[PDB]
Amino acid sequence: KPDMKIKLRMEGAVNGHPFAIEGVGLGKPFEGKQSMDLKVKEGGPLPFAYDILTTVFNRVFAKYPENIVDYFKQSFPEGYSWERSMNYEDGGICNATNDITLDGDCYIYEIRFDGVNFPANGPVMQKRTVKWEPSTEKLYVRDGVLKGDVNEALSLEGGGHYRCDFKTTYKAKKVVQLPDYHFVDHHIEIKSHDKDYSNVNLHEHAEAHSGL
Amino acid sequence: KPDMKIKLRMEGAVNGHPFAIEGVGLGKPFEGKQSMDLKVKEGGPLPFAYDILTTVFNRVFAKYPENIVDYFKQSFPEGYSWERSMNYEDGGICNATNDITLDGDCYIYEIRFDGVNFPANGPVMQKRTVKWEPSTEKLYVRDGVLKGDVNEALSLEGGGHYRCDFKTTYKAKKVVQLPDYHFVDHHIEIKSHDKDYSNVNLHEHAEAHSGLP
Amino acid sequence: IKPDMKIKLRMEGAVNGHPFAIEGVGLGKPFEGKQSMDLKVKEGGPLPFAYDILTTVFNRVFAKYPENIVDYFKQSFPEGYSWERSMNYEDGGICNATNDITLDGDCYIYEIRFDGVNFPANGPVMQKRTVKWEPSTEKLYVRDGVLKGDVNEALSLEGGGHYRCDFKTTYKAKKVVQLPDYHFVDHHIEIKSHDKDYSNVNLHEHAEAHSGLP
Amino acid sequence: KPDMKIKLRMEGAVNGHPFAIEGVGLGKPFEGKQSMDLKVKEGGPLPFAYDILTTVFNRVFAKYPENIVDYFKQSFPEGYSWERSMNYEDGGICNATNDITLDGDCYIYEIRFDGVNFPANGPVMQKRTVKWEPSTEKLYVRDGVLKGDVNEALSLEGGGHYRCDFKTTYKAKKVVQLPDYHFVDHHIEIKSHDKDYSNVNLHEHAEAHSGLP
């Protein structure tokens, strides 16, 4: 529908220390906009940069034009799942999965997040990240499913950027029409939060296009 | 000027077998469009997919809006150089350099290209590539200079895509104002070629933008 | 630490989003660098992936260290140590694992988490086309006061050939210990026996530290 | 024969700076020892750490036991070639090739070396490297080809280590027997050099093994 709800629970760990986060949100799938509120349930206060979590906190919330087949909106009411590996340049690596289902007008996410090898004096473990830059995801078919790798970067507390390469596999629960090679522009932003990020308001604007 | 000239020479090797290519072209830097005709002088007929070369055959040919500092157009008349690593997903990797100078209204490229570890049954050696797909390049400043990364993909013959990780370092020959984080959309196309790619007409269209607001 | 030590572990994890859980008990000789264990699948069975991606997660205390190489791991006890590991396979599949090692009398206790993603449906892992890990030589070096370990490891495949994986591990002692110099550890891990569905597995590994070509 | 000599010329560039080096050397292939003296012919004084070149300056100089097929000694008198990518952890990447022939008792190398994207503040451009650590190479057959991977590391003058991933493809000029998965221990050492490394005396010891028995 034009206004949809979001409910999620993320269970995960970073450098072996476990945590859990829950969120409620709402979004406009055809306008490619969404927002949500999250609150650390376990493992707080988080000792790592919250920004590594945010892109894990749904490509149905993307404005697709009529000329590009919409893989994600097709998959419902059954839904879809995805897996993702996020490779940071300093060796830190996060693996994540999300199983997305639909209950009425509410998407339900079951999330697992696992990051390892983040250096003690790195920007993640020292909370020196500021914000994800906006980005352009490249989506393409392989083995009958959809993949979407990206060239991400976090702006840092004194300038400069901290790069991370995202690799994702999108799997529909049913048979859907596979799209052609296309792109999705992203802009994810934390609009507000408390001191230790126990509470976080997160927004994302995502839009598909066919390149130049 | 609104219309610029282009002359180039690439000397290189792929899997240890040397080759050399020269080209002539022209473009409109403020429109971000260019075209050129390339001829292989040595090492022909090339035993690898010509497409691995095309992105090596100049970001001055990109339409920059006023809201984004133009590092490349600033760097002239002195010019600039760039270094690039091209890591394909099956282990083949090409490293390339280009020293760009200006003589009147003509850009001069001196290009080196060396690719290795392309598997014999891979799409490059078997020449099963069709086209580069359009791409979006991410530019950011690091330690005083400018970088550019692209996650590119080659369209293949039987369907599917063959990905390549681009990583480029841009160095102006003079000090210029460094730009903020931004993007450049690309679309490179071989519009015409002869059978063994001894002659190639190559086009590229490029535009910088700041991404979604 | 004694010539004969005990092991039991529990691993909880998921591969391509399919969760599973495994428990094991074992024994070994830390000063001889040999060990063996029996593992049982408790949840997520029958496992739909190659069991071989799990085995290197199922302890560098079981490595024969010569006197001239500082033993980072044997020093860390009785308090113990932990490690994190990223295993980067050449076809894009990636596994992250952690192990928190404690000591109870003569028994090592492992708390293990394992998470692998992006394994293609037709790749050797999901199709269980792996045979065994080849022997390997680990390279260990200090960075930021802790110990690192990288190996170029390869799985032999079921009709000839090898399937590569990049191991990169951070070792973290829970107390202050003396840091070693750059050194090596030779490995050979082998599944000695198992039932048809890999619900039961008997796993062994031998390891020996050295300092390269003398 | 137990005593062989070496003569080589390497032509290359690092970050777009071309250079050339020639060397003469000697070794005992059946014991896995060799040494050579290298002289910089062009591009001196080299502005990068000489350590990036040495593993490019022949696995015929490795002691192979009887129970492991020797791909390299089988490859002569015709010889063999190899291609290699060396991926440093800070993004620096070098591509190298070597075409190895035999003239009487002298191995002749034709070497190309191309390194890109080394940061100006990194240990290579700053020249803060000490030596390569010993290493163990893993070799295996793929696609009728012999492959070689090493996780290398450079010791730095402050204790730390600067890792590099080695990927090499070995190709005999004739069809020869292929070995099973095995290992080669390495220890490469610069035993002497002048201040700006215009003269370098390089040694390497290597011995193949099957791993932990």
TrEMBL record, chain A:
Q: Which GO terms describe its molecular function?
A: identical protein binding; metal ion binding
Modified residues annotated as Phenylalanine amide in this record? F57
Q: Where does Cu(2+) 1 bind?
A: H193
Which GO biological-process labels does this protein carry? bioluminescence; generation of precursor metabolites and energy
- Transferase keyword on record: no
Kindly indicate whether the keyword Endoplasmic reticulum belongs to this entry: no
Query: Which keywords annotate this record?
Result: Chromophore, Luminescence, Metal-binding, Photoprotein
Against Gene3D superfamilies, the record matches this protein to:
3.30.1300.40, Green fluorescent protein
Write down the InterPro entries for this protein, in alphabetical order. Answer: GFP (IPR009017), GFP-related (IPR011584), Green_fluorescent_prot (IPR000786)
Q: Which residues bind Cu(2+) 2?
A: H203, H205
Q: Which family does it belong to?
A: Belongs to the GFP family.
Its protein name is: Fluorescent protein Dronpa
Q: Which organism is it from?
A: Echinophyllia sp. SC22
TrEMBL record, chain C:
Q: Where does Cu(2+) 1 bind?
A: H194
Q: Which residues bind Cu(2+) 2?
A: H204, H206
The answer, when asked if Protease is one of the entry's keywords, is no
What is one GO biological process annotated to this record?
bioluminescence
Superkingdom to which the source organism belongs: Eukaryota
Name the UniProt key words of this record, in alphabetical order.
Chromophore, Luminescence, Metal-binding, Photoprotein
Mention one GO molecular function: identical protein binding
**Stored Gene3D superfamilies:** 3.30.1300.40, Green fluorescent protein (2.40.155.10)
Q: Which residues carry this modification: Phenylalanine amide?
A: F58
Entry similarity comment: Belongs to the GFP family.
Q: What is this protein called?
A: Fluorescent protein Dronpa
Provide the organism lineage as a comma list: Eukaryota, Metazoa, Cnidaria, Anthozoa, Hexacorallia
Gene (name only):
Dronpa
